[PDB]
RNA sequence: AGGCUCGGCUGGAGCUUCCGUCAGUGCAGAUCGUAAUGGUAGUAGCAAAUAUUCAAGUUCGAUCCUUGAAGACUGAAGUGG
């Protein structure tokens, strides 16, 4: 119950509507963040470099506007950590947002 | 009245009555000299030179130190040698 995945749509053109050209990427992974942290109820949330590679893919201020996200809540190895559980998001390769939900893995 | 005596506390080595006489003898000012301190005030402000992000390392402690990945810049009459 407390180790858990799954995959999420993240709207990332409305997320980060109306940011400034030189802030849009770092405010879209601040985002990615705010999102796993409300959906997986986690304080402690990492984006793998591959995450952070595709939210840069397309330069600084070209963010892509959805990004399709594996969030795996699972238990933080290191015990003299202030919270039990960590988030860690994963980047899922997508061609076609149409029809996809959020999924159970 | 100029000032003075005593009491209480602090302090640790000098001070004092009266008689003569002498003077570098009395400060609120001089945009006075010098030293220190306020309100202003946690205020004005720390805005030129495109820009940083992710993961990890070390550490009591990391936007700023180091490693890797990415994204940008100087653009050879360079931010190079």
């Given at each position: 119950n407390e180790?858990?995945?799954?995959?999420?749509?993240?709207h990332i053109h409305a997320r980060i509507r109306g940011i400034?050209?030189?802030?849009?990427?770092?405010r879209a992974?601040?985002?990615?963040?705010?999102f796993?942290?409300?959906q997986m109820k986690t304080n402690d949330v990492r984006?793998?470099?591959?995450?952070?590679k595709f939210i840069w893919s397309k330069?600084?201020?070209?963010?892509p506007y959805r990004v399709r996200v594996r969030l795996s809540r699972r238990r933080?190895?290191?015990?003299?950590?202030?919270?039990?559980?960590?988030?860690?998001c994963?980047?899922?390769?997508?061609?076609?947002?149409?029809?996809l939900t959020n999924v159970n893995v």
């Open positions: 180790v858990v995945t799954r995959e999420y749509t993240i400034g050209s030189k802030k849009r990427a770092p992974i601040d985002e990615i963040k705010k796993a942290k409300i984006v793998d470099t591959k995450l952070n330069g600084i201020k070209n963010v933080n190895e290191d015990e003299d950590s202030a919270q039990k559980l960590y988030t860690l994963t980047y899922v390769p997508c061609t076609n947002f149409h029809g």
